[PDB]
Write a protein that binds this DNA or RNA. Structure first.
Lengths: 59, 171, 64, 125
RNA sequence: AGGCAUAAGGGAGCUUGACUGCGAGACCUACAAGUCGAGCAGGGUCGAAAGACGGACUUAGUGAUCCGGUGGUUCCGCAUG
RNA sequence: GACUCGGUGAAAUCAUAGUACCUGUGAAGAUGCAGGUUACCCGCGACAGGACGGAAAGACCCCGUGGAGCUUUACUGUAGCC
RNA sequence: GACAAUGGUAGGAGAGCGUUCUAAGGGCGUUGAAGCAUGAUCGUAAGGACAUGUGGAGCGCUUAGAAGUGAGAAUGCCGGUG
RNA sequence: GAGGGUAGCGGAGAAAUUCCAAUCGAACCUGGAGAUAGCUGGUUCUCUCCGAAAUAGCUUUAGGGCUAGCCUCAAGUGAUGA
RNA sequence: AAGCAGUAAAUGUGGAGCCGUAGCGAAAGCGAGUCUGAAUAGGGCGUUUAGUAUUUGGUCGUAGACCCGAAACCAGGUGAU
RNA sequence: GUAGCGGCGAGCGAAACGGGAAGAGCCCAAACCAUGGGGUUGUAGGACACUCUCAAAGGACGACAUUAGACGAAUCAUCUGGAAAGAUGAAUCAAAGAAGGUAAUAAUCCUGUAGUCGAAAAUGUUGUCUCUCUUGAGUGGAUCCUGAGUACGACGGAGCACGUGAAAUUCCGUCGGAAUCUGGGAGGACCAUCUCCUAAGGCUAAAUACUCUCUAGUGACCGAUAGUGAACCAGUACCGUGAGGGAAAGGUGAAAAGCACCCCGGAAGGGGAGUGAAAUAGAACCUGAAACCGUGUGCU
């Protein structure tokens, strides 16, 4: 569905553990956020992860 | 001769010479099933679990054939002693064969002037094996390929002057 | 399938040069004010697993 | 001879075959006695189970550790000697130098080796 | 409950054997456990000495392993220190 | 409807049966054992005392270190919510 | 020869019979194999022959080897029939 | 009446644990799967020799199990058995 | 042993590896002794001095493991005629 | 079944050395130069200086094999028979005595086998020559490059034989966040010293797993309740709304020679008469057991 347009940031899936170590499946979403960027075909708006918009991509 | 070892050599060889390609289908393999036929409790019929169980017909073999090997081994020294005992009981020898062309009548004459014969030659003469593979009761081989089943199946041994020496060198 | 050893009994007992085993001694971990100096010193040694226990457990240590 | 074969007297026996009649001795119950957890296909309790009472090898304290650098040697006595480590291998004495050939002093009588017992270094001279 | 007036009961002086390493042999015992023990070596206390002393007149007052803590130590410490 | 006649024609049940009563005995309620008493061989219509009659591997009771559903301030968790 | 022993459930040990196939050897068979039916037969048992009918083309026997190796019980499965 | 919609860790319920294809305190079908069953039932030929137990201890144990007691086969010691 | 040769065969070759002739200790490490110990003092374990390879049978272990038989659980679908 | 991992329980359980099958290594980004060229690495390589000279991808080119086939040795006679391949005689072939069929049991009767030969054409592969490609190599070094929100840290997880542990080596999400050859990393926490390598770009055949599928074959594998559920027009009758479940069903004879004709009968079905070696082998057709149903009769 959603993933970083620039990087490949997906969501993972791990276990929410406990104190009794009773694990249950959880996910690990990526810090994805909409923003307008100059995809050189035209200015669009897309999902970008806050990591990937750390100093290296122009809005 | 050592009969206690020669028996095991023969039995070992006839065991090793089996395929073992024989199978059968148990509950897991027979088609269908996976449905209890009736309810187990109110019918009046016996309680059953599937129509492909052993007591039925058409389903299920409890044990039986499986594709499995039959050969086994035994020590090098016992192998060599069984071969020595077989030759020892044969003892209990001609010049070289001369066959330009494979001509079975020539070989039949050669066997008559001298019917379970085992004609043992040197490395391989490919006009004596051919001259002799059609006669019923005659088996030909070489000093590197002396079986124990071959030997003990034979009523006679016809080994050349060279094969006698090569087997005296081997064993 | 090789028969597996009992990896919790290999941490406890060893085999001697007669085919018999050399276990440790129980009652030697705490509550030492509740034992005689004889009973504390008599337990410091080691003993052999009895024949009954060579009955229950002898294939659990067949490689050891 | 291939039509009169005879295995050595005492080698072979016919297997025991249970559950076939009551005149063999192992027919009805087939050597299992009457009802119970051990007269059921699926075996009894696992070996070493002991029924609920805490088993032996969980009721005794653990003991020691294992050294990583354990140097076990090839033990030769002075009866084997009635001399490089290689010649001692190529004679048929040391079929494996585990760490090195150590010479001991049991028996009676030059030697290159990696260690020596006291009795050995005495009785070689 | 069994013994005790050898006192095992009472009083007084002196001290720390309420020791360290052990242990022939035996009782009990399904196992794990439990009980007794002459004698031997190191060090001593009492006594003038022989000697006695490894708790209490005897038998209850206790809880496997795993794991954690602390004190030492000769051991190990994943190329070497 | 049943009953008799012509036509057609099942079913549950069923160890083999030449299948009596009584007083006993017996796994303590016998057609079948003991001791007695009674009964010539075969049907047909009818009744419902016994065959511990027949159907339904007792829905009761208890036992599975058996399941399932429900409850809660039982244990450990969890969607969610702050 | 003489003496001694020989009830048996759970269970332990030994010796055997029989079935299908395989190797070797040696045989039977359209002048009639296997099978089936009958029989008044031999063995301590599992069982083995023989004869006659029926049948129409394959089977024993010795010695070893290998097993899908023996059925009266599973409210067993399928078919037939009461 | 016709045409449609809601589906099982679910749906509908004027509420009965009521309905969801003659089945519902959680449908049916196929797979994991030959689940597991310390429980019932069954377990196929002959002969020869020997021949028990229903007890102790511990047990989440009490119709189960483990060690010991009682049986059997082999080797040995060797008079130690009554 | 795998491998290579060999008729889906024996069999030849293949010494990596395994078992054994040495044990004791947790270990360093000693070694016909060793560990505990101040001390063979005593004591534990050793010094039996034949093992090994293949296979017949008995039995056990991991695989459904003597056969039949649940109530149930999970996953993926088919169902509102 | 070792080291270890484990309510240290049930259990899980490596790897390197050693022996073997197979076996090749390479193209980039960066510096620099004029989209192109140059350059690809650890006993440091490249640039820069001299000197000294899979790997790029389209195409034709004769042999082998695969898809129909041809040849293919050598026997006659009596007894039984319904019928000879059998039994009894004499004989030949064998690089062919595998197998099947033929009125019975065949090396010589047929189809075959041993062996040799065969391709209009299509196709796959091996081969040469064509074809496209193509600058190789040492020495010195001031200096310029060698993969950055990357390595790594903290937190929460996953994975390593390894359960958060003293957890090294690898990944994921979230924040912070490095150096550049005396640089970086690893050697089971960690530091020092040594030893070995050079991350953060990419591509690679073989040794290996398996079987729809074609051809050739073997079996101490089954032989019609077996073997596939299906030897038979079978995933079919049938069952279900549906997903889906699912059977029973083989044999005349060597050859149909499969009963012309007559009689009873409405036909079916019979009894003769013929075919046949056999008809109680007459298509409900090889044998033809038992339960079960009958008719007759010796003893009661």
């Amino acid at each position: 569905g959603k993933q970083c347009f620039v990087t490949g940031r997906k969501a993972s899936t791990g276990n929410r553990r406990s104190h009794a170590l009773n694990s249950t499946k959880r996910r690990w979403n990526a810090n994805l956020q909409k923003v307008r960027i100059l995809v050189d075909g035209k200015p669009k708006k897309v999902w970008v992860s806050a990591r990937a918009l750390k100093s290296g991509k122009v809005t | 001769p050592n009969n206690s070892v020669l028996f095991e050599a023969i039995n070992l060889q006839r065991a090793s010479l089996r395929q073992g390609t024989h199978a059968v289908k148990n509950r897991s393999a027979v088609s269908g099933g996976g449905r209890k036929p009736w309810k187990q409790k109110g019918t009046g019929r016996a309680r059953q679990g599937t129509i492909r169980a052993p007591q039925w017909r058409g389903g299920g073999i409890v044990f039986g054939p499986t594709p499995r090997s039959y050969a086994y081994k035994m020590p090098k020294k016992m192998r060599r002693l069984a071969l020595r005992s077989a030759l020892s009981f044969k003892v209990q020898v001609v010049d070289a064969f001369n066959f330009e062309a494979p001509k079975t009548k020539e070989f039949k004459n050669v066997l008559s002037t001298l019917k379970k014969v085992l004609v043992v030659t040197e490395n391989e003469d490919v006009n004596v094996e051919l001259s002799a593979r059609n006669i019923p009761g005659v088996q030909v081989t070489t000093a590197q390929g002396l079986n124990v089943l071959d030997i003990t199946n034979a009523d006679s041994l016809v080994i050349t002057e060279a094969a006698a020496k090569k087997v005296e060198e081997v064993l | 399938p090789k028969m597996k050893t009992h990896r919790g009994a290999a941490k406890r007992v060893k085999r001697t040069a007669s085919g018999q085993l050399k276990r440790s001694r129980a009652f030697t971990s705490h509550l030492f004010a509740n034992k005689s100096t004889k009973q504390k010193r008599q337990l410091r040694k080691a003993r052999l697993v009895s024949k009954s226990d060579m009955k229950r457990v002898k294939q659990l240590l067949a490689y050891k | 001879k291939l039509h009169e074969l005879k295995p050595a007297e005492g080698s072979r026996k016919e297997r025991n075959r249970v559950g076939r009649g009551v005149a063999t001795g192992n027919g009805k119950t087939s050597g299992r006695g009457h009802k119970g957890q051990k007269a059921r296909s699926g075996g009894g309790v696992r070996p070493g189970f002991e029924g609920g009472q805490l088993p032996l090898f969980r009721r005794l304290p653990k003991r020691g550790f294992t050294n990583i650098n354990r140097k076990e040697y090839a033990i030769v006595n002075l009866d084997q000697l009635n001399v490089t480590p290689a010649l001692l291998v190529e004679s048929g004495v040391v079929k494996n130098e585990k760490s090195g050939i150590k010479i001991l002093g049991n028996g009676s009588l030059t030697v290159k080796a990696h260690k020596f017992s006291a009795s050995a270094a005495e009785a070689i001279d």
